[PDB]
């Protein structure tokens, strides 16, 4: 995955679970949740972006 | 008359016009053929 890639959220406790988002940036450092994904639908708190782990996102073909 | 027509395209004005037209043709059907309990055919 990279910037601009489309991924499916696999985190169950997510307002965008099973949904598709756009990767903003994948951090190359040793952070726990490097993948930053932007969504079109705001969550219940109003935010439309979140940091996800490498195993919590699945790239769409 | 470019933004006025856009204003008339807003949800409230369009809904009011559509519901006014709808109530109008319903009321006029019931005036010209009143007391219709069953299908006319």
């Amino acid at each position: 995955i990279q910037k601009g890639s489309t991924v499916r959220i696999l985190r169950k406790e997510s307002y965008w679970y099973n949904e598709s988002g756009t990767v903003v940036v994948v951090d190359q450092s040793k952070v726990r949740y490097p993948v930053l994904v932007r969504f079109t639908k705001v969550n219940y708190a109003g935010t439309n972006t979140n940091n996800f782990g490498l195993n919590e996102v699945e790239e769409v073909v | 008359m470019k933004d006025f027509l856009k204003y008339l395209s807003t949800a409230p004005v369009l809904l009011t016009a559509w519901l006014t037209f709808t109530a109008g043709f319903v009321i006029e059907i019931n005036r010209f053929y009143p007391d219709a309990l069953t299908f006319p055919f």
């Binding site: 985190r11 406790e13 997510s14 307002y15 450092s29 726990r32 949740y33 935010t47 979140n50 940091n51 | -």
Partner: protein
Amino acid sequence: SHTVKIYDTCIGCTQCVRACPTDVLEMVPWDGCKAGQIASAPRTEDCVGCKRCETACPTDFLSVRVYLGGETTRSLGLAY
């Protein structure tokens, strides 16, 4: 006293600490995020349960969680 837990989804944005009305949360060094900081709850005896801390949390499903528990004159906000 109520129970406050911090989860590693913390991004160290400090919004929880600066929203606590009773000085329960504080920022401590960490190496799990870009900011290098994580929230801590070392003074939960002063926790009142107002949940302002998690109203300011930007992470998806929160990184600070307040579990209401036994009540105390401090946790009940009793000036009398």
